[PDB]
């Protein structure tokens, strides 16, 4: 099992898996930090809008009152954030596919 985290749904919080050495670092409800460079699959389920942040940037927007994430290249210190404007049919996580170069 690769390095992977999930957060949610409540009141389960941040579950880590193959943590040693870490690839991700929880930092809040719905926010975590990238400890290692790589290719990451982000996923989840969101049960007026939701936005998915890679640090400063809205990489998804979920503007229906659905699935979340996709695949990205990420680097030490990138934060990923799932922001809200019914939180138990809601969760996201991330799995680390590979570490190329760049």
């Amino acid at each position: 099992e690769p390095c992977m985290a999930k957060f949610g749904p409540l009141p389960s919080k941040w579950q880590m898996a193959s943590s040693e050495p870490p690839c991700v670092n929880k930092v809040s409800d719905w926010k975590l930090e990238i400890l290692q460079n790589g290719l990451y699959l982000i996923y989840g389920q969101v049960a007026f809008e939701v936005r998915l942040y890679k640090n400063k940037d809205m990489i998804q927007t979920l503007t229906n009152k659905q699935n979340v994430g996709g695949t990205y290249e990420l680097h030490v210190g990138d934060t990923i954030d799932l922001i809200f404007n019914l939180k138990n049919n809601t969760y996201w996580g991330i799995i680390l596919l590979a570490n190329p170069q760049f």
Copy 2:
């Protein structure tokens, strides 16, 4: 890695790295999940008009992807936590669409949570 694939027709269900098996088929287009895991679903609808145009993807009773057409070719699936006992299926409003059309599944990971 445990995986499967339906179609495109005349091929029916095909199964890769079993033992232990992660999924089992129900009928054409419908499969069952025999274990908990993080799964990646994929495939593609080849569009090819008396009924409205639609295909949907279900987990259990929940439509989880609606592919309301652009009668172009569109990706099926996405990433999902699935449980022993779920069933995934792909439903045609009518049979319309073509047969460069298939959908398949692969189990990425099965962690405790």
Copy 3:
């Protein structure tokens, strides 16, 4: 872990290595598939119309909804993917079971 990435410019093709090569650069934004398997294609159109193609068929188009490109497909030897504009993308080989 067979993979490759084209942008973002002026980086061009960037390929990690691999037991046997699963992929070969054809030219900018375009690659050819050298082995059957399941692949995950990814990228970002940059935080108009962009389009992903497998051979002659268009499999995704971006145009401000909300996105990054790609998805997961079963690709075959001799297939090609490009991205056309009218930003980077990459591919990884997830698997390649005997049923291709």
